[PDB]
Amino acid sequence: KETAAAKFERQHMDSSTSAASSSNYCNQMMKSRNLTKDRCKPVNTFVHESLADVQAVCSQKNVACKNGQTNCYQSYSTMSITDCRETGSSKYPNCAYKTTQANKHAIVACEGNPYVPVHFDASV
Ligand SMILES: [Cl-]
Ligand SMILES: [Cl-]
Ligand SMILES: [Cl-]
């Protein structure tokens, strides 16, 4: 199987780049991270910061989650983030995504020991 922490790293971490390069970034990242292996993930976010920086968010501003869980945290400073969403013309296995780059505060759900991100709630 895949631990929650490892899944978050695969699905949302991207420290190799400082920002989404071109409009084909999401089509490639969603593919290479295996987010389109069995089906097209409708929406997914990538953070362009070190793993340490993203994990550090677990000890920053503790905010409520969308579902109501009290284990979400918001990064004190804005981070380089890329939002990948399926376009109107996307059908498995031909998944197509729209790349929307921006700098927003990352909000992640943390759990376990070490207390690391296991879910990406939103970006604000
Ligand atoms: Cl794993
Ligand atoms: Cl995988
Ligand atoms: Cl996401």
Curated annotation (Swiss-Prot):
It is found in: Secreted. Changing H12A: Loss of activity. Transmembrane segments: none annotated. The keyword Magnesium does not apply. Disulfide bonds join C26-C84, C40-C95, C58-C110, C65-C72. Glycans are attached at K1, K7, N34, K37, K41. Its EC number is 4.6.1.18. GO terms for cellular component: extracellular region. The active site is at H12, H119. Keywords: Disulfide bond, Endonuclease, Glycation, Glycoprotein, Hydrolase, Lyase, Nuclease, Secreted, Signal. Substrate binds at K7, R10, K41, P42, V43, N44, T45, K66, R85. GO terms for biological process: defense response to Gram-positive bacterium. Pancreas. It catalyses: an [RNA] containing cytidine + H2O = an [RNA]-3'-cytidine-3'-phosphate + a 5'-hydroxy-ribonucleotide-3'-[RNA]; an [RNA] containing uridine + H2O = an [RNA]-3'-uridine-3'-phosphate + a 5'-hydroxy-ribonucleotide-3'-[RNA]. One of its GO terms (molecular function) is ribonuclease A activity. The keyword Heme does not apply. Interacts with and forms tight 1:1 complexes with RNH1. Dimerization of two such complexes may occur. Interaction with RNH1 inhibits this protein. Monomer. Endonuclease that catalyzes the cleavage of RNA on the 3' side of pyrimidine nucleotides. Acts on single-stranded and double-stranded RNA. Belongs to the pancreatic ribonuclease family. This is Ribonuclease pancreatic.
